[PDB]
Each structure stands twice: as C-alpha cells, then as structure tokens.
Symmetry: D2
Subunit: 119 residues, 4 copies
C-alpha cells in the first residue's frame, strides 16, 4: 500500500532533458546533486560531504512545467518514489540503478525568489 | 533524533513577514494539505510553519494565499498545560518551494 | 496526497488494547521522541498513535512503557472548534517495530 | 545540514552478513526487498509492483543487535541516509550504487510478535 518515498533537496546538474514518447506524452529527466554537510571535528568550520546524485523522472504536464522553469544549478525540493530501473552494459549484463519517480518538485526559495504562474 | 516531515499543500493565507526586535526576518504561514483520490477529499491537515533569514523574505515575495508549496522541516510540538490541556504543532521549515505540478515559475537567484 | 511521517521514540505507557463493538482489535499508544545531541535534550514531541487488526494485538503483546520503537504512518489532525479552538494530531500507523539500536529481539512470525 | 533521509519497509533477502573491521568494529550488511502494490484497474484485485532492493549498512552495537535478531525473510522498518558508494568492474570502470546507511531498524509487528531485550 506504501511505496518507498523520498524527499531530496539539491541542485540540478544540468538543464532538464525533455523528450516526448511516441504517444506525445512528455518526459523530463534530470539529476539532483544533494550535498550533505558534517561538523568536521578536530578544529575547522563545516565540510561538504560526499554528494549524492539521484536521477529523477517526471511526466506530462509536470514535466513540461519543469522544462519551462528549471535549469542547470537550480536548487530544488523533490518528493517521489524510489524505483529500480534495469539497463544494459556493452558486455551483456543487466545492471540496475535507483531513480526517483517524481511526485512533486519545486525551486527552493532558500537563495532565490520565484514568480509563480498557475496553469 | 529530530522528527522530520514533508508536506505538500496550499497556503491558507499570504505569508506574514516580520522582523524580530534584533532585525531578523521571520515568515509565518499555514499549509493546508487536502488529500484527494476528483472524488472524495480526505481530512484537511493545517500545519503552521515558520522560516527565518533570507528564505523568509523570499517566501513573502514569492508566495501568496493559494500557492501550492512543498515544505520540508522539523515537526515541533508545544503543550500549554493549564487551568486544561492544550497542544499545538508547528514545522520549523528547512526548505520550501512552490510546486511545479500545476504551475510554472520564473526563478531568480539571489 | 497523504502526509506521512516517521517517528522514533519511547512509548510513554504500555499500549492499551481494545476491541470495537464490531470485534476489531485496536491499540493506542503515545510515542515520546526526545532528540539529543549526552548533552542537551531537545523538545520532547509526544505523538498519539493508533493501529488496527493483528498488528494491534502484536503491539500489545510485544511492547511496553519505555520500549523504543520506529513508527511510520499518516499524520492526522482534528480541530474541536468551540465555546475556543483546540487541535490535536495523531498518526495512523502503517508499520511499527521495536528498534534494535539499543536492544535485541526474538522475532516470531504469525 | 540535512542528509537525504529515507524510511523503507520490506523483507531481508537473506540472513544479515556480519563482519568486523580490522579495529574490531562490527559491520552488518543486508538488502531490503520492498514490494509496493498498485490497484490494477481493468478488473482484478491487487497486484504486486516491481520490488525495490536496497543494500543497507549498519555499524557496531546496532550491527550486532541486527545479527542476533534478524534473518532471511524478516520484515523490517528501516530509517537511514542514502549514500552513493563506488565499486570496481572487471572491465576497469567505477560504477556507483545507492545504499542506506542505517540509523534505526526494527522487526515489523505487522505479521509478527517480538520479545524485546534492552541492552
């Protein structure tokens, strides 16, 4: 009844890639780079932790809205479901990767303002 | 050890921006989350939210009554123990953004 | 569209097991979540929880006052609008288990 | 300040693998198989969705407690942080995978009871 759900905050590594299926349905893909931060004891200020890079998918109107509104570097908040997709290596094997099927996404207002236009 | 929460919903009213006596910007708003499954609204959940600093000012400039938002933060609770027991909750907002589910946005850094 | 929450904390009291007039088992318990960072407790957050069916009976059999638990469920809110405004929250528990952070458990299916 | 956090519910695919670092610190690894469920419209009851398999890591006392308490098939609830680890293929390349650094874990009481013993 419950999918595995997630919230990620981070920046897009690149402009959202927008495609259209053969039916005309829009799909946008992008990756969120999430930079955590540790205390870094033994003197010293903060220290950025290893970044997590999550590939995200989103469909139809929401995908179009993402393509119209976000770009490389955009700081975003994303909620969605973690899904495992299967791929194919040039050596025959099927290696999986975890991606986010996005439910909702928006630009963070932490360091930015936004002019919102409702559909 | 902090209990975190993500809520999606609509501002019940325009964010109220103030400044502490110290000069620090603070914004208060309430998120109304009404689940649906175009048939049958669920119970409506109204979460009081507070946020600070530049984010506070960006919220006040960018969002209004009705704006659909994604909010993540820490869930807080108070009890006013009394004459009579009263509790409220509140979310100390870490990040907030307008949802692009049903809208577009022109974004402007800094 | 449902707002979910995960909370980690300790039962304030032994779970209270009842049966609806229908015969359905229900358990009520409250989770006290006290964040720490062995220096400085944070604010304590007490979430009323309800769960149903076999899970209700397993909770009542397995957990007591003090038991450290991991709880995920849907956050619910009520307003008692009145003579005077009063709200409470509650978590409709999807799953619950005792944490193995500071304890072991002998587990027994069914 | 915020890591990317997650809650997963599922079953262990196998008994937890327990190891000890050269310092004597315990580490347990295991994978949670999370089976979501869709409505399956166009007549028909429920239908299990594609399972998500997440590799989980946990350390020290908590790892020992997991090894003492859980086995293959154990239904569990897990909270933790999503981390990307780097590996090495037999063809030279470094392929990453997302894992859970476990904060807390416990056996679900959904279909089971537990005798809890506090340390």
């Amino acid at each position: 009844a419950g999918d595995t759900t997630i919230t990620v905050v981070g920046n897009l590594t690149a402009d959202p890639e927008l495609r259209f299926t053969p039916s005309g349905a829009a799909v946008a893909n992008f990756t969120v780079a999430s930079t955590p931060r540790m205390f870094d004891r033994q003197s010293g200020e903060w220290k950025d932790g290893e970044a997590l890079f999550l590939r995200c998918n989103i469909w139809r109107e929401a995908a179009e809205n993402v393509a119209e509104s976000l770009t490389r570097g955009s700081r975003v908040i994303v909620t969605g479901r973690l899904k495992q997709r299967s791929f194919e290596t040039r050596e025959g094997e099927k290696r999986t990767v975890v991606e986010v099927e996005v439910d909702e996404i928006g630009p963070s207002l932490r360091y930015a303002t936004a002019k919102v236009n409702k559909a």
